[PDB]
Design an enzyme around this catalytic site. Structure first.
Site, short mmCIF file in Angstrom:
data_model
loop_
_atom_site.label_atom_id
_atom_site.label_comp_id
_atom_site.label_asym_id
_atom_site.label_seq_id
_atom_site.Cartn_x
_atom_site.Cartn_y
_atom_site.Cartn_z
N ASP A 46 12.67 -35.39 0.99
CA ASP A 46 13.86 -35.73 0.40
C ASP A 46 14.61 -34.68 0.30
O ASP A 46 14.58 -33.93 -0.59
CB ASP A 46 13.50 -36.35 -0.97
CG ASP A 46 14.81 -36.87 -1.52
OD1 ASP A 46 14.66 -37.46 -2.70
OD2 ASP A 46 15.72 -36.74 -1.07
N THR A 47 15.74 -34.43 1.12
CA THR A 47 16.50 -33.15 1.25
C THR A 47 17.42 -33.24 0.03
O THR A 47 17.96 -32.21 -0.24
CB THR A 47 17.29 -33.35 2.65
OG1 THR A 47 17.95 -34.36 2.83
CG2 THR A 47 16.42 -33.01 3.67
N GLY A 48 17.68 -34.25 -0.57
CA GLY A 48 18.36 -34.53 -1.75
C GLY A 48 17.79 -34.03 -3.16
O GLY A 48 18.47 -33.91 -3.97
C1 LIG Z 1 15.05 -41.08 -5.85
C2 LIG Z 1 15.41 -41.19 -4.65
C3 LIG Z 1 14.28 -41.97 -3.68
C4 LIG Z 1 16.69 -41.93 -4.27
N1 LIG Z 1 17.84 -41.13 -4.88
C5 LIG Z 1 18.41 -40.12 -3.61
C6 LIG Z 1 17.74 -38.68 -4.08
O1 LIG Z 1 17.78 -37.83 -3.10
C7 LIG Z 1 18.53 -38.02 -5.19
C8 LIG Z 1 19.86 -37.59 -5.05
C9 LIG Z 1 20.60 -37.18 -6.30
C10 LIG Z 1 20.89 -37.86 -7.33
C11 LIG Z 1 21.12 -37.26 -8.46
C12 LIG Z 1 21.53 -35.81 -8.63
C13 LIG Z 1 21.34 -35.18 -7.41
C14 LIG Z 1 20.79 -35.75 -6.31
N2 LIG Z 1 17.38 -36.67 -5.77
C15 LIG Z 1 17.27 -36.61 -6.98
O2 LIG Z 1 17.06 -37.50 -7.87
O3 LIG Z 1 16.41 -35.48 -7.15
C16 LIG Z 1 16.10 -34.94 -8.58
C17 LIG Z 1 14.65 -34.42 -8.20
O4 LIG Z 1 15.06 -33.14 -7.84
C18 LIG Z 1 16.20 -32.95 -8.45
O5 LIG Z 1 17.35 -32.35 -7.72
C19 LIG Z 1 18.44 -33.39 -7.69
C20 LIG Z 1 18.36 -34.12 -8.75
C21 LIG Z 1 16.72 -34.35 -9.01
S1 LIG Z 1 18.96 -41.91 -5.53
O6 LIG Z 1 18.35 -42.16 -6.92
O7 LIG Z 1 20.02 -40.68 -5.46
C22 LIG Z 1 19.69 -43.14 -4.61
C23 LIG Z 1 18.92 -44.34 -5.16
C24 LIG Z 1 19.46 -45.60 -4.31
C25 LIG Z 1 20.20 -45.54 -3.32
C26 LIG Z 1 20.63 -46.83 -2.80
N3 LIG Z 1 20.33 -47.93 -3.14
O8 LIG Z 1 20.96 -46.81 -1.46
C27 LIG Z 1 20.92 -44.38 -2.99
C28 LIG Z 1 20.38 -42.88 -3.52
#
Ligand SMILES: CC(C)CN(C[C@@H](O)[C@H](Cc1ccccc1)NC(=O)O[C@H]1CO[C@H]2OCC[C@H]21)S(=O)(=O)c1ccc(C(N)=O)cc1
Lengths: 99, 99
Positions: free
Chosen positions: B25-27
């Site tokens: 997960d690059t995010g």
């Molecule tokens: C938990 C993952 C599996 C899903 N998420 C993508 C992640 O990369 C999500 C993206 C993000 C969200 C909020 C703030 C900053 C970054 N990453 C994320 O939650 O990371 C956590 C753990 O590491 C930390 O750094 C970033 C914030 C912290 S998500 O919640 O943002 C999301 C959920 C559902 C969908 C969808 N329905 O398409 C798209 C994105």
């Protein structure tokens, strides 16, 4: 480009005539942008992530230019803390993970 | 390997003697795993994502093997809906984004 991951993989996008920064996020199925003005009609949806869920507006067939690569697809708009470009758009710009 | 993004980028990891699947997960800045038994000391932390915050336990210097590649770093444990491998570990296994 090749992008290493020592810093957040932030890129510039152009959407709805506006310039924004968003994170290339392989952990996201779909693209989610903070509240912004977008042309279309839209549909209500719920999306869940780490700490629960948010309500988004789903806009279909929206054009995004992601570092000067055009993609068309679904964009969800709502109270995300960060603009996220998800796999639905990453696949169109030919983005892969390599190790 | 090279990994395209038409499906979720799930890999098998071995951590704490246990086998799990986790999303590359690059995010994510840091690695977050669902509740599991991990050897050692830990410190309380909160992390925020799309829908708010969860409370996690922070473990430092934890060994993970991700597709047979070894990395040591911080692992956060708590009520995430999915196991996530974050950039803190992706950098160690040489993982890059390419388009
Ligand atoms: C938990 C993952 C599996 C899903 N998420 C993508 C992640 O990369 C999500 C993206 C993000 C969200 C909020 C703030 C900053 C970054 N990453 C994320 O939650 O990371 C956590 C753990 O590491 C930390 O750094 C970033 C914030 C912290 S998500 O919640 O943002 C999301 C959920 C559902 C969908 C969808 N329905 O398409 C798209 C994105």
């Amino acid at each position: 480009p090749q992008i290493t991951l020592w810093q957040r993989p932030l890129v510039t996008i152009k959407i709805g005539g506006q310039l924004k920064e968003a994170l290339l996020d392989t952990g996201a199925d779909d693209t989610v942008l903070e509240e912004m003005s977008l042309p279309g009609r839209w549909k209500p949806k719920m999306i869940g992530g780490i700490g629960g869920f948010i309500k988004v507006r789903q806009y279909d067939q929206i054009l995004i230019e992601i570092c000067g690569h055009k993609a068309i697809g679904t964009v969800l708009v709502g109270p995300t803390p960060v603009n996220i470009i998800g796999r639905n758009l990453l696949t169109q710009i030919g983005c892969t993970l390599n190790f």
